[PDB]
Amino acid sequence: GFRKMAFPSGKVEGCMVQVTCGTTTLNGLWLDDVVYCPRHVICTSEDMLNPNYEDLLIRKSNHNFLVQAGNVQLRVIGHSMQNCVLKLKVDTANPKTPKYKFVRIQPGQTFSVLACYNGSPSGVYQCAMRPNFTIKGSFLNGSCGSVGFNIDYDCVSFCYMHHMELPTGVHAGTDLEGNFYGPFVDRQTAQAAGTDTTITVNVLAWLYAAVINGDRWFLNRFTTTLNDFNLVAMKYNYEPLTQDHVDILGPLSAQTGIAVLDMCASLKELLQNGMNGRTILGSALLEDEFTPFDVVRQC
Amino acid sequence: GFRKMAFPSGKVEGCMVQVTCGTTTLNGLWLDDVVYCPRHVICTSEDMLNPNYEDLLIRKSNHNFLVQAGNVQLRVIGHSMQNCVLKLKVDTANPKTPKYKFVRIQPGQTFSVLACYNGSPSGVYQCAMRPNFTIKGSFLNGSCGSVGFNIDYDCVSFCYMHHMELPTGVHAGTDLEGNFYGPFVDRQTAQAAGTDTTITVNVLAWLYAAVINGDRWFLNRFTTTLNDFNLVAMKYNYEPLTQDHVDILGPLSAQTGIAVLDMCASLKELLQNGMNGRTILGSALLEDEFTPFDVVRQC
């Protein structure tokens, strides 16, 4: 079968603490003896319109930070400020720190999000970094600080840290070095994201997964060139397919015996004529949240 | 926002072992000093057409069972056979055994599945127990023994253990006492499941979640009685709505200010006239995989 899956969240639960700065309470990541968290923990619900995080960080001393690993208080001994995130050095090192790394995913790359509230893991779901650098996730108040991650067998790659919910209903945050994903800033303002395109490669890899799972009615006897299809897709707000993406689709093209350009033709007529009531993999829409690697992983 | 989420799989990863009986290798659940697993581990790929599990279990001694918790071999000291599952008592008790219970979910109830292969957790996704006692999950060879679970803060409720992939593409298994969910038997035969209905209450709770999230175009100025709507839905292969389900929808009806019967009217015209191209919560289909409790949990 073919489901939307997330990496096992186990290893990340062991790094989930509750950070507080006065009234404000948001989640933090405890890796080794450092606790990474959004810098807007030093803010009040009235110091959000436009806060100078440099002057706000002046008055805040180590004792203004309450890190609580479950029911056990860690001691903030030092505090740094990398980009939009705080970095509170603590006395104890995490005995549960797994083999980890800090990465920056690209538009189209998917990762699991362990949504936490008050330091407690609430649940896990999978999202892609939309080409407009936003995520269509599930966050409420107090979710800030929840992280996005992928796993390389032993190694947990961290790629996201939640910050805000944009006007259009979608979410935005940073990588683990504090740099925002996109043109966003950490302030309460009407800062809407641009127009969203569809990750073409991710839909082709989904149709490849669909063929592998038995749903193959959409398949036509046609072909098209990369120049031909790419120019057709561009009109429908689709991520321009490159020869790189074609190669990434390799193992799927091999498993299925269907050329990448043969698959682009079936998609081309699907864009021109619509799905007309029918369903692919039990979905009445063209799903782009699955990378070629996501599909291979489920085979 | 509104995503399909699974409970944090952490606590379950600590109970995931690799069980082997000759050539055959499938996953097992190590709770306290007992390892629960599907009884068809004692089978060969030629002893599946119709195997007498009583006579097959005769020749198999404790030393024919290789339980490997990661890289550490446990010692099978005793072996029982509750319904379709084996129960191998081991020397060491699991130091990571969480507060757990064994439950039997009902058609309509959803749970997280931690899909394991060779004792290793491969990933987690959420499914409901379809009214025809099958699950639309994601399983390959060696996935048998992967468990389905819900969490009550401290307490992990176990409700499923994978056994097979039915002809129609969907999966079927047992509860943790070995009893199959549905009319299925553990043998390799053409045993297709009946016609599937739609969990009406789960769609109403999804439209309630949709209203809470801003998508509310489907809402009409009409109403209907429980007798009226229920008889209309029955024609479209829908689970007959009971007054119990109406009460369960309570907190959602309260959050939204929309009566349960007002919501059934919008669904009634949606069934009669179709969605005509439009999308609710970014879905071009009526989604029934979310219980009222699933929706409350994300609020």
Ligand SMILES: *[C@@](O)(c1nc2ccccc2s1)[C@H](C[C@@H]1CCNC1=O)NC(=O)[C@@H]1[C@@H]2[C@H](CN1C(=O)[C@@H](NS(C)(=O)=O)C(C)C)C2(C)C
């Ligand atoms: C996050 O959990 C935080 N809450 C608080 C509360 C007080 C002080 C600091 C923080 S961080 C929260 C999560 C989002 C709430 C709605 N769903 C979420 O994902 N983040 C916010 O509320 C951020 C936060 C301030 C304002 N805010 C917003 O997202 C606002 N939208 S916006 C992008 O500014 O248009 C708000 C929801 C209208 C900052 C940006 C620091």
Ligand SMILES: *[C@@](O)(c1nc2ccccc2s1)[C@H](C[C@@H]1CCNC1=O)NC(=O)[C@@H]1[C@@H]2[C@H](CN1C(=O)[C@@H](NS(C)(=O)=O)C(C)C)C2(C)C
């Ligand atoms: C499960 O992992 C097992 N594999 C083996 C191999 C040897 C011995 C025992 C087992 S249990 C496996 C998982 C399914 C494979 C396809 N995707 C899955 O979810 N289960 C099976 O292969 C079961 C197993 C024997 C036959 N089988 C089937 O599902 C067959 N379909 S059926 C329901 O019999 O129509 C097969 C896929 C055609 C039993 C039932 C013991």
